Design a protein around this ligand. Structure first.
Ligand code: XYP
Length: 305
């Protein structure tokens, strides 16, 4: 099997581990991988994809920079019998064959569940991510799925709901400060949607003497987030191991090149079709499993804690 991998952006740390695990795993399955990076550019990506189609790849793996505008290039690929796999970000209104990501709804469920595990009754502030980030709404659906029976039954009372523009720690800091002022510090848990916003909220909580007293969730397992969890000031984070995502995408890619129809958790609509999807299970990280998750995986080093 010939794989073309069109990564939007390899100039950052973002996708580089994904490339390397994907490449080494695909090769080990008996496949050749040609990789290009669009250096953040949407027109470079169109060209590199066209380049792949014209090299005779059997499978395209695309991490899109702008997934609203690859419809023609995908159609062109399908016309040649090439399979398209959308890696991590969905490709919209395109005739793709597969989608692999972590299950973002599950990220939300994990976040809210770790919080009702310790604060089954009390005042909750909802801190969503960017209101233009579709993933932000996904985390919030998962969070609300878990909260619903507690809200409807009066055990949990929602005392604010704000979305953090740009996921900026400093916007999250202001948001939190406003929520604390408006509730005269009576906030028992904060459903923050990532580590960076949680971190800004924690700074507001710290400045009122409430650090360690208010439950707060997160996501990404940022080093600093891992440290706050060890220190008691953040409750939990959700880890999304690259090696798992990259490993599973390679196996799907190879499967797709072999006419086979790979294992899909569900079917997401991209606004043209019901795309089969593997939505990997994300990992709850708390104070007790830091070593067994993010250290073991190599994501962070013990000497760094
Ligand atoms: O991993 C998170 C990502 O999915 C979301 O889109 O933006 C914030 C990050 O914390």
């Amino acid at each position: 099997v010939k794989i073309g991998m069109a990564i939007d952006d390899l100039r950052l740390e973002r996708w580089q581990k994904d490339r390397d695990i994907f490449v080494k795993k695909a090769e080990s399955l008996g496949a050749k991988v040609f990789v290009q990076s669009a250096n953040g550019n949407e027109e470079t990506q169109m060209s590199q994809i066209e380049n792949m189609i014209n090299r005779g790849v059997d499978v395209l793996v695309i991490i899109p920079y702008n997934g609203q505008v690859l419809s023609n290039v995908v159609k062109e690929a399908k016309q040649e019998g090439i399979k398209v796999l959308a890696y991590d970000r969905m490709i919209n209104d395109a005739d793709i064959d597969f989608y692999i990501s972590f299950d973002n709804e599950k990220v939300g469920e994990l976040q809210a569940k770790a919080l009702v595990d310790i604060v089954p009754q009390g005042n909750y502030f909802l801190m969503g991510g960017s209101p233009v980030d579709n993933n932000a709404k996904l985390f919030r659906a998962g969070q609300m799925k878990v909260l619903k029976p507690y809200v409807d039954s009066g055990k949990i009372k929602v005392v604010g709901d704000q979305w953090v523009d740009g996921w900026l720690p400093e916007n999250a800091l202001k948001i939190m400060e406003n929520a604390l002022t408006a509730n005269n510090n009576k906030i028992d848990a904060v459903v923050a949607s990532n580590d960076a916003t949680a971190g800004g909220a924690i700074q507001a909580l710290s400045a009122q003497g409430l650090s360690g007293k208010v439950a707060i969730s997160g996501q990404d397992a940022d080093l600093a987030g891992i440290k706050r969890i060890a220190a008691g000031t953040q409750t939990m984070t959700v880890y999304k191991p690259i090696t798992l995502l990259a490993n599973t995408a390679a196996e799907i890619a190879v499967e797709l090149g072999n006419g086979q129809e790979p294992k899909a958790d569900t079917t997401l609509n991209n606004g043209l079709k019901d795309v089969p999807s593997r939505l990997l299970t994300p990992i709850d990280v708390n104070k007790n499993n830091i070593k067994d998750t993010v250290i073991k995986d190599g994501f962070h080093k013990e000497s760094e804690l």
